[PDB]
Amino acid sequence: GSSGSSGTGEKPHECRECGKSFSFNSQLIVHQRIHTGENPSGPSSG
């Protein structure tokens, strides 16, 4: 089972959804499609 750790890396594009980081925008965009794309466990409030 996956684990949890701190300090992943600083990138010019962070995912306010989960907290991920992508050196490039195009990337963060393809990832965010996972939050709005489906209906996970409470993605966001507003």
13 makes contact with Zn ion (CB under 5 A) = no
- Kindly tell me which residue out of 11, 13, 14, 20 binds Zn ion, with binding defined by CB under 5 A: 20
The rounded distance, in Å, linking the Cα atoms of 36 and 30 is: 11
Contact 43, 35 (CB under 8 A): yes
- Kindly tell me which residue out of 11, 14, 17, 21 binds Zn ion, with binding defined by CB under 5 A: 17
**Least distance in Å: CB of 33 to Zn ion?**
9
| Closest by Cα among 21, 23, 46, 45 to 32 | 21
Q: What is the contact surface with Zn ion in residues (CB under 5 A)? A: 15, 17-18, 20
